[PDB]
Design a binder for this molecule. Sequence first.
Ligand SMILES: N[C@@H](Cc1ccccc1)C(=O)O
Length: 219
Amino acid sequence: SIDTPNYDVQKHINKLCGMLLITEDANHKFTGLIGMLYAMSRLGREDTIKILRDAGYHVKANGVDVTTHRQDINEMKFEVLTLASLTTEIQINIEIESRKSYKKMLKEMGEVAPEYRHDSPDCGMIILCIAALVITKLAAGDRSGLTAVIRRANNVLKNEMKRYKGLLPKDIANSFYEVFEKHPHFIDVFVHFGIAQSSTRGGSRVEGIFAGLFMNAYG
Ligand SMILES: N[C@@H](Cc1ccccc1)C(=O)O
């Protein structure tokens, strides 16, 4: 069974990416999956299914809905997603860890600027820039291109790394190497996502960085 998020959970996945990005010494074990879930909510449920079926994969679609979970950790209310690939506990521990780093940020700077927040609209796209680097290096059938991925990420995502303490290229890249090796159908989803993304036109810097990195996968 594959999780097929639709456009309605896009804003939620974006905030999930940014929660990981604000976390200092963040456990990026699930970042590859979360990044792939984001691209899927940008494509939508119908396109994702069509992409997978046409590429010869037998896929059992699972609807992604927003659930409210309550747990005593103060009685706290959490907004979570119905994912077969990601438990309610994993999602809630992501929020708990990021709220700790947010509290630390508030103590140091006083008020968090919009571009330093977990709900900045470019958070999901920041994560997907690492995936664009990983995709270029998969052909070698190993992980020898990792040193080059970190080298490029430090240069191309220089401003983004100043904005987020949780933007750790080695960890995020290892997460995408594992997810593309374990679930090769995500490579098809991501390739289809990047071509549809170059059609996007707006004022986002990271949308532009992604469009440039994606075209570098050709030549
Ligand atoms: N003030 C923040 C608290 C928070 C930080 C980090 C993650 C989740 C929540 C908010 O409501 O968005």
